[PDB]
Amino acid sequence: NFSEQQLINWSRPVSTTEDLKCQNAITQITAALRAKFGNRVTIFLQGSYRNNTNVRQNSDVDIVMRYDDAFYPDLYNFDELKADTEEALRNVFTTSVERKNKCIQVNGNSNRITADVIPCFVLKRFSTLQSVEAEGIKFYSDDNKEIISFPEQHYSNGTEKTNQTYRLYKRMVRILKVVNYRLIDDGEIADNLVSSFFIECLVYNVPNNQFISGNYTQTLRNVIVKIYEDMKNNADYTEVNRLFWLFSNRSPRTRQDALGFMQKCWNYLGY
Ligand SMILES: Nc1nc2c(ncn2[C@@H]2O[C@H](COP(=O)(O)OP(=O)(O)OP(=O)(O)O)[C@@H](O)[C@H]2O)c(=O)[nH]1
Ligand SMILES: Nc1nc2c(ncn2[C@@H]2O[C@H](COP(=O)(O)OP(=O)(O)OP(=O)(O)O)[C@@H](O)[C@H]2O)c(=O)[nH]1
Numbered sequence: 001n002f003s004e005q006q007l008i009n010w011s012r013p014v015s016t017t018e019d020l021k022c023q024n025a026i027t028q029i030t031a032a033l034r035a036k037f038g039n040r041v042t043i044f045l046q047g048s049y050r051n052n053t054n055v056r057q058n059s060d061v062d063i064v065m066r067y068d069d070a071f072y073p074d075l076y077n078f079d080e081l082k083a084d085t086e087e088a089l090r091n092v093f094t095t096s097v098e099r100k101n102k103c104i105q106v107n108g109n110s111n112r113i114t115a116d117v118i119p120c121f122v123l124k125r126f127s128t129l130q131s132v133e134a135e136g137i138k139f140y141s142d143d144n145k146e147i148i149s150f151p152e153q154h155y156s157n158g159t160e161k162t163n164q165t166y167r168l169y170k171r172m173v174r175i176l177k178v179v180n181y182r183l184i185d186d187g188e189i190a191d192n193l194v195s196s197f198f199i200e201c202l203v204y205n206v207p208n209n210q211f212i213s214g215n216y217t218q219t220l221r222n223v224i225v226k227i228y229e230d231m232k233n234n235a236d237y238t239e240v241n242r243l244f245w246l247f248s249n250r251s252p253r254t255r256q257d258a259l260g261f262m263q264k265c266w267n268y269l270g271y
């Protein structure tokens with residue numbers, strides 16, 4: 001239903017860290033957090049701006065604030081950390097600050113994008129897949145869930161795969177994110193059937209030899225068919241971080257979710 005050129009267009013990043021409104025958000029929010037926490041935190045990005053997978057204009061940026069003085073000192077429970085983070089932001093951004101289940105949101109304006117600020121601590125956890133202790137981040141949601149993430153390993157492994165696949169790994173992720181948003185807008189799937197993270201992990205497990213240089217239409221066909229068949233075949237997919245399984249008992253998302261999503265994409269694209 002869509003031409004090769006249309007797929008190419010959909011595969012391009014829309015919002016990036018080069019955007020003035022993104023730079024403005026990061027600069028302003030960083031200053032507000034440093035005013036309270038100084039060097040006791042590491043500030044970095046995760047999510048679509050970090051991995052370069054944005055497909056929507058003026059997308060929100062995920063700014064991680066890792067309180068890590070104990071692990072990275074200068075050469076306290078989470079409830080207090082999140083409250084102190086909300087206070088630091090409210091002192092500067094006042095009515096634009098909204099506490100959320102998993103972050104503090106700083107709503108944007110004409111000159112800056114909206115940001116999700118994610119206070120967190122250092123996390124260390126053993127990976128049986130790689131038989132090593134892995135370092136990531138941990139935080140707690142307002143509904144009492146322990147949220148664990150490995151953004152550095154996610155970033156590095158995804159970058160490596162796109163570098164090995166003629167840059168098509170992330171281009172295919174972006175295409176599927178576009179299709180996801182369209183299916184949601186059309187009311188064809190629930191807005192939480194999949195997530196950007198889930199899509200990124202699914203495509204990551206498609207072997208590199210399925211990505212065909214200069215052929216977006218056939219590469220995308222290969223990607224959808226491979227994930228679809230793998231889901232029917234009970235495949236053991238890894239997260240992009242390669243430290244844990246995608247379909248582990250910690251995750252409520254299922255192979256059936258991925259199978260249904262692939263089917264909806266296939267039908268929408270008209271293969
Ligand atoms: N391990 C793990 N990490 C997650 C999960 N959800 C989000 N993350 C992390 O948080 C980052 C930002 O989350 P999202 O905003 O939902 O994903 P995104 O890549 O920014 O895509 P967008 O929907 O365009 O914002 C992702 O890149 C992941 O690194 C999850 O379910 N499991
Ligand atoms: N450090 C470094 N940066 C580069 C290099 N080549 C290009 N860049 C730049 O790094 C930024 C990231 O570029 P890309 O990784 O190609 O991202 P993109 O072009 O927006 O999207 P895709 O190519 O589809 O992944 C851009 O500003 C490029 O100009 C390089 O060899 N080394």
Ligand SMILES: Nc1ncnc2c1ncn2[C@@H]1O[C@H](COP(=O)(O)CP(=O)(O)OP(=O)(O)O)[C@@H](O)[C@H]1O
Pocket residue numbers: 046047062099100101102103116118147148149
């Ligand atoms: N496993 C995870 N690991 C790291 N960051 C996560 C994460 N899940 C969510 N986040 C981050 O927290 C931010 C908020 O996540 P969302 O998916 O919007 C739920 P929420 O918005 O916090 O609940 P709410 O809208 O009901 O208040 C995301 O932008 C993301 O950057």
Ligand SMILES: [Mg+2]
Pocket residue numbers: 046047048049060061062
């Ligand atoms: Mg995001």
